[PDB]
Amino acid sequence: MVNWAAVVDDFYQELFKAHPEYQNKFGFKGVALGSLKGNAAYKTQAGKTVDYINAAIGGSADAAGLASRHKGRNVGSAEFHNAKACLAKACSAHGAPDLGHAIDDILSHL
Ligand code: HEM
């Protein structure tokens, strides 16, 4: 099965390398990138991200709900376009299918 957990870890490395300030919105604010895997707040968030990806592939993702929740953290279209780029890099690094359509689905509600 596609190792989405590893893809998601690479995604967040890419995301926070390019936009370190995004990390401030999370419960693992301040934590060195090389330590995220040892952080409990990160483990939970990465698991939810993997779940969302499996839901988008499986046909049950609530893109409108996810978008609304990100607006509720003042995260919008700009951040998601950055995320789309980072996730495309992470997918390609693992020979995984691209998730651009799923991110487009979220973007359509932002
Ligand atoms: C590929 C794009 C992304 C996906 C699939 C994704 C997915 C998720 C998921 C599944 C949750 C949990 C929602 C829930 O518990 O109901 C979440 C929460 C969150 N996301 Fe994202 N996200 C993405 C990008 C971003 C970006 C770019 C930011 C920018 C800072 C961000 C900030 C947040 C924040 C602050 C929360 C709340 C975390 C908390 O409760 O401590 N997300 N995201």
UniProtKB/Swiss-Prot annotation:
First and last residue of the signal peptide: none
Molecular-function annotations in GO: heme binding; metal ion binding; oxygen binding; oxygen carrier activity
Top-level taxon in the UniProt lineage: Eukaryota
Positions annotated to bind heme: H70
Key words, A-Z: Heme, Iron, Metal-binding, Oxygen transport, Transport
Domain Globin: 2-110
PROSITE patterns documented for this protein: GLOBIN
Keyword Cell cycle tagged: no
CDD domains linked: Mb-like (cd01040)
Family classification: Belongs to the globin family.
Function: Acts as an oxygen store capable of sustaining neuronal activity in an anoxic environment for 5 to 30 minutes.
Quaternary structure annotation from Swiss-Prot or TrEMBL: Homotetramer. Self-associates in the deoxy state. Seems to dissociate upon oxygenation.
Protein name: Neural hemoglobin
Source species: Cerebratulus lacteus
Lineage: Eukaryota, Metazoa, Spiralia, Lophotrochozoa, Nemertea
